[PDB]
Amino acid sequence: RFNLPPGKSGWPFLGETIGYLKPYTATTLGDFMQQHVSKYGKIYRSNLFGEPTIVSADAGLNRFILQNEGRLFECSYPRSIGGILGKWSMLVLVGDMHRDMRSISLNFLSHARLRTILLKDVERHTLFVLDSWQQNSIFSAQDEAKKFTFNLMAKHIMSMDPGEEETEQLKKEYVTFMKGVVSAPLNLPGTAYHKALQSRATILKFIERKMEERKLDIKEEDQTDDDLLGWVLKHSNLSTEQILDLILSLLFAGHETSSVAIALAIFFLQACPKAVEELREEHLEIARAKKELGESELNWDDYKKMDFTQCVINETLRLGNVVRFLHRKALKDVRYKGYDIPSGWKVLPVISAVHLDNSRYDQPNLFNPWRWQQGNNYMPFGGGPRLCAGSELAKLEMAVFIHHLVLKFNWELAEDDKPFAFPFVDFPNGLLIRVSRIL
Ligand code: HEM
Ligand SMILES: CC(C)(C)[C@H](O)/C(=C\c1ccc(Cl)cc1)n1cncn1
Numbered sequence: 179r180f181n182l183p184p185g186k187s188g189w190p191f192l193g194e195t196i197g198y199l200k201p202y203t204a205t206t207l208g209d210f211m212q213q214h215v216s217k218y219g220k221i222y223r224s225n226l227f228g229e230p231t232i233v234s235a236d237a238g239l240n241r242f243i244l245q246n247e248g249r250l251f252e253c254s255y256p257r258s259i260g261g262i263l264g265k266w267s268m269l270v271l272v273g274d275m276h277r278d279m280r281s282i283s284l285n286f287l288s289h290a291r292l293r294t295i296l297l298k299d300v301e302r303h304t305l306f307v308l309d310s311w312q313q314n315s316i317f318s319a320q321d322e323a324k325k326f327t328f329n330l331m332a333k334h335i336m337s338m339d340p341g342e343e344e345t346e347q348l349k350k351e352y353v354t355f356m357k358g359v360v361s362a363p364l365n366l367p368g369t370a371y372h373k374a375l376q377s378r379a380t381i382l383k384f385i386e387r388k389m390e391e392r393k394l395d396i397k398e399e400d401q402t403d404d405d406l407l408g409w410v411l412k413h414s415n416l417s418t419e420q421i422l423d424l425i426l427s428l429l430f431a432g433h434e435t436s437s438v439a440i441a442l443a444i445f446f447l448q449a450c451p452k453a454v455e456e457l458r459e460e461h462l463e464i465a466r467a468k469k470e471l472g473e474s475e476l477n478w479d480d481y482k483k484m485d486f487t488q489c490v491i492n493e494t495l496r497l498g499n500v501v502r503f504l505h506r507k508a509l510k511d512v513r514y515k516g517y518d519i520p521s522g523w524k525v526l527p528v529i530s531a532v533h534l535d536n537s538r539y540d541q542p543n544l545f546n547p548w549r550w551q552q553g554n555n556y557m558p559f560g561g562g563p564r565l566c567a568g569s570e571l572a573k574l575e576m577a578v579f580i581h582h583l584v585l586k587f588n589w590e591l592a593e594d595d596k597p598f599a600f601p602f603v604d605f606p607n608g609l610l611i612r613v614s615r616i617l
């Protein structure tokens with residue numbers, strides 16, 4: 179194990195971030211962005227992730243970039259990220275195989291499947307986590323949200339059941355694996371990146387074992403495409419290596435961001451009692467109607483009643499900005515507002531910028547869910563051809579979690595030392611809270 183001389187952790191300039199809100203990280207993104215925008219304006223150049231880079235806090239340019247994917251710009255992560263996610267990870271791929279994998283993901287996460295299958299299981303996994311919560315006892319809201327979102331995705335990707343020893347161990351392995359993307363890409367014994375590469379090998383071996391079992395399942399039930407692993411084996415022509423990277427990546431994407439989104443909602447709501455009251459009123463009415471009909475499990479009609487919840491969700495994503503920026507590269511010389519973006523340079527559209535623009539939002543730094551009672555100024559899931567394939571599941575997860583959360587608990591920050599300080603919220607300790615049962 180190398181004893182490297184001390185120094186700043188993570189990527190140069192930004193610290194431990196690759197563009198999204200990651201709990202438990204040491205990040206300087208907020209100060210970097212505010213200082214450069216103040217000094218150079220909304221479109222400036224720097225050197226980030228090892229390359230000359232144009233950073234865009236300009237809403238028009240960000241829209242222009244996302245809409246011109248494949249023609250003027252393309253998704254482009256640092257090459258070191260390929261070692262973590264794999265050569266066939268759709269999150270970093272462009273071209274025909276990305277198109278095929280996006281089509282798989284859109285089928286896996288379709289509206290039809292949300293209504294018929296995923297909604298029932300979202301509630302089950304929500305209650306599984308919430309029923310274990312104890313009162314008056316400090317814990318990480320982010321950790322608990324990640325338990326929920328990971329269990330849900332592990333169930334529907336590989337049929338793994340919540341709380342089973344193998345499911346908890348895989349989740350722990352993902353912690354080490356995912357830290358690799360925000361670490362300095364130093365492949366030396368003892369570094370977070372090296373450990374992340376080891377975790378990748380461990381996870382890939384686990385997934386391939388599950389794949390061998392599913393191949394037997396398919397053969398036996400011939401003489402089973404319920405989970406994504408079975409579906410891809412039967413309905414796609416992906417190679418083993420491509421199946422492995424796809425599962426690895428969807429399980430990553432399927433629980434990293436949605437857990438943070440739920441933690442952000444918990445954070446914003448504890449500071450806005452009026453919103454909690456209106457949520458409780460909304461979800462109490464939903465429960466009353468279901469009791470009046472003798473129903474016990476949520477259905478799609480219940481979800482459609484959650485009008486103010488959707489306002490809370492929209493406002494949580496607008497102000498919390500799970501995704502701060504995306505990774506692009508110019509395919510040609512591009513001119514915008516008189517500036518030249520050279521061919522081959524990295525381009526980082528800071529998509530959170532339009533969300534905090536006081537030209538687009540009255541009091542953009544204020545958590546005001548009622549603004550959505552009265553998108554082009556709203557892009558927490560991106561835009562253009564790579565728009566989040568799991569956006570509707572993410573909102574369903576937040577809404578169902580909030581539904582049971584506000585019916586069952588009050589909550590409070592571990593200490594009253596956490597005010598929302600523009601521009602970016604960080605969760606260096608995983609949002610510690612305490613709950614009290616409503617009874
Ligand atoms: C609050 C939760 C989430 C947020 C804020 C979010 C955000 C985003 C964004 C901004 C993109 C565009 C990336 C780019 O253009 O480079 C994206 C893509 C994607 N998201 Fe999410 N996401 C969330 C949840 C999820 C979930 C729960 C899943 C799956 C279970 C998922 C699956 C995907 C996939 C597969 C893509 C890539 C689509 C493609 O490359 O064509 N996301 N997401
Ligand atoms: C973070 C996103 C939204 C830009 C990205 O697209 C993603 C996962 C991802 C994480 C690390 C790396 Cl290095 C690359 C991709 N997610 C998309 N949906 C949920 N997460």
Ligand SMILES: [Cl-]
Nearest residue numbers: 538539540549
């Ligand atoms: Cl507004």
Ligand SMILES: [Cl-]
Nearest residue numbers: 605606607609
């Ligand atoms: Cl925190």
